[PDB]
C-alpha cells in the first residue's frame, strides 16, 4: 500500500506546462493534428459572447 | 558490504517499520473533514469572529527568535486591570485569558493593552435580550453588521 503512488511537480514547471498547452490551442496545425475536426470553424482562438455563461 | 565511497548510513529499519506504517490516503478527505468544521462552527456562532477570540501580541523566546512576535495564548491578568476588563467577563466577550504570564515590561504591557482598548471600540456587543438596557451597542450599530471576521482577529503583523 505504501508504494509511492503519487508524484510531484514544481509549480513553475506545471504553470508553463499550461502555457505550452494553451499556446498550441491556437495553431490549427497542432489542434487539427489531434483529430479535432476544425475545418469549417471561423477562427481558432475561438472567442464567444459572454451571453453563453 | 560497502563499496568505494558512499556515506555510512545508519538507516533505522532493524526494528519493524512494516507493521506500523501510516500511509496518508486520508490526507484529502481529512482536509474536507476539517473544512466542514471551520464551516459549521462559523454558521453555528453566526455573528462571532470565525477565527476565535482576541489573542495578544507576544514575543518569541530563545535569542534567535527575539525579533518575531505572535498570537500568544491569552492576554495576561495584570494587562486587564489597566484596560478595565474583569477577567471572568473577558472570557465571555471573546477576549482570551491566559492567567499565567509574568509581565516584566511596560513596553509590551501597553502595546498589548492597546489591543483591548482597540477591541472594545470596534466591538458590537449584541444585547442579552432584544429589549435590553446598557452597554449593548445600538440598533444602528447592529443592523450594519452580520459580519464574521474571516481570518485572525486584528492580525498581528511583524
Amino acid at each position: 500500500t505504501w508504494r509511492r503512488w503519487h508524484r510531484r511537480v514544481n509549480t513553475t514547471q506545471k504553470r508553463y506546462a499550461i502555457c505550452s498547452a494553451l499556446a498550441a490551442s491556437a495553431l490549427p496545425a497542432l489542434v487539427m493534428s489531434k483529430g479535432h475536426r476544425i475545418e469549417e470553424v471561423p477562427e481558432l482562438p475561438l472567442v464567444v459572447e459572454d451571453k453563453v455563461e | 558490504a560497502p563499496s568505494r565511497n558512499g556515506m555510512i548510513l545508519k538507516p533505522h529499519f532493524h526494528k519493524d517499520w512494516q507493521r506500523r506504517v501510516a500511509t496518508w490516503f486520508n490526507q484529502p478527505a481529512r482536509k474536507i473533514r476539517r473544512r466542514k468544521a471551520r464551516q459549521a462552527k462559523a454558521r453555528r456562532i453566526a455573528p462571532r469572529p470565525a477565527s476565535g477570540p482576541l489573542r495578544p501580541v507576544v514575543r518569541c523566546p530563545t535569542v534567535r527568535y527575539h525579533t518575531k512576535v505572535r498570537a500568544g495564548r491569552g492576554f495576561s491578568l495584570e494587562e486587564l486591570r489597566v484596560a478595565g476588563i474583569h477577567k471572568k467577563v473577558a472570557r465571555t466577550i471573546g477576549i482570551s485569558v491566559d492567567p499565567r504570564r509574568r509581565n516584566k515590561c511596560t513596553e509590551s504591557l501597553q502595546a498589548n493593552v492597546q489591543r483591548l482598548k482597540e477591541y472594545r471600540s470596534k466591538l458590537i456587543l449584541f444585547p442579552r435580550k432584544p429589549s435590553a438596557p446598557k452597554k449593548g451597542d445600538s440598533s444602528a450599530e447592529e443592523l450594519k453588521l452580520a459580519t464574521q471576521l474571516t481570518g485572525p482577529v486584528m492580525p498581528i503583523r511583524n
Binding site: - | 466577550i93 470596534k122 449584541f126 453588521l145 471576521l149
Partner: protein, 122 residues
C-alpha cells in the same frame, strides 16, 4: 375465513381461549389425517390452522400485556418484563435529571457571566 386480528382484538379473553382450543383440537386431527393419507386439501390446512393459533394467541398476550402494563403504569415498583429494555449501557446512562443538574456554584456563574453574542470590526 381467516381468523384475522380484526375480529379478535375487541373480544373477551375467555372467548379467545375457546376459539384457540377449537383450533388446537382441529390441528391434532389434521396430524392424524396426515398419517392416514388424508388429502392435499387437508394437508394445506394444517399450516393455516397452525398460524391461526398464532393469530389467536398473539391477541391474548397482546391484550393481557396492554392491560397489565396499565396497573403498574403510575406505580413505581414494577416488574422486569415491562421495565424499558433499551441496552445495558443505555439503562445505566444517567437519568436525565442527573446530567442537566448543575452545582449551585456553577449556576451562580452561568447567571453573572453568560456569553454574549457579537460580531466585531464595525
Amino acid at each position: 375465513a381467516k381468523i384475522k386480528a380484526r375480529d379478535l382484538r375487541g373480544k373477551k379473553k375467555e372467548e379467545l381461549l375457546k376459539q384457540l382450543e377449537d383450533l388446537k383440537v382441529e390441528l391434532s386431527q389434521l396430524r392424524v389425517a396426515k398419517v392416514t393419507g388424508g388429502a392435499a386439501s387437508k394437508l394445506s390446512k394444517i399450516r393455516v390452522v397452525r398460524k391461526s393459533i398464532a393469530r389467536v394467541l398473539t391477541v391474548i398476550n397482546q391484550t393481557q400485556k396492554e392491560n397489565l402494563r396499565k396497573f403498574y403504569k403510575g406505580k413505581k415498583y414494577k416488574p422486569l418484563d415491562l421495565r424499558p429494555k433499551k441496552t445495558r449501557a443505555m439503562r445505566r446512562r444517567l437519568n436525565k435529571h442527573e446530567e442537566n443538574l448543575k452545582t449551585k456554584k456553577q449556576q451562580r456563574k452561568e447567571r453573572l457571566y453568560p456569553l454574549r453574542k457579537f460580531a466585531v470590526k464595525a
